[PDB]
Specification:
- The PDB classes it as signaling protein.
- The complex is a heterodimer of chains A (110) and B (6).
- Chain A has five helices and no strands.
- With 110 residues, chain A is mainly alpha-helical.
- In chain A, helix 3 packs antiparallel against helix 4.
- The two termini of chain A are 13 Å apart.
- The chains are: A mainly alpha (110), B little secondary structure (6).
- Chains A and B meet through helix 5 of A and loops of B.
């Protein structure tokens, strides 16, 4: 667990989690409960903040760049599946802005 | 998709 990775866990994930718009990204999209029976055929690599958080907490990542790619996948999946004025896209967009600002302050490995 | 999440 590099210090960039502990920053992803202690700073990026924590800051995003507390956001009022973050909760649709806490858990995998459940295509049955939400009646999106095409979701897994369009979105081949599902990702969510809960899975990212678990991977950080259990030292799954080899580098912070893998963690960031999961974040990038999470947001991009949202945009792939949804429409530009959907509430979910506005929520993703607000979260993504904070994400970009927070990883800009990520410390260097030393 | 997903409706009105506000």
């Amino acid at each position: 667990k590099t210090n960039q990775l502990q920053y992803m866990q202690n700073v990026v994930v924590k800051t995003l989690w507390k956001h009022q718009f973050a909760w649709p990204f806490y858990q995998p999209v459940d295509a049955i409960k939400l009646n999106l029976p095409d979701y897994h055929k369009i979105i081949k690599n599902p990702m969510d903040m809960g899975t990212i958080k678990k991977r950080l907490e259990n030292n799954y990542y080899w580098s912070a760049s893998e963690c960031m790619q999961d974040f990038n996948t999470m947001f991009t999946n949202c945009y792939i599946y949804n429409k530009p004025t959907d509430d979910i896209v506005l929520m993703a967009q607000a979260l993504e802005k904070i994400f970009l600002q927070k990883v800009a302050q990520m410390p260097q490995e030393e | 998709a997903k409706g009105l999440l506000l």
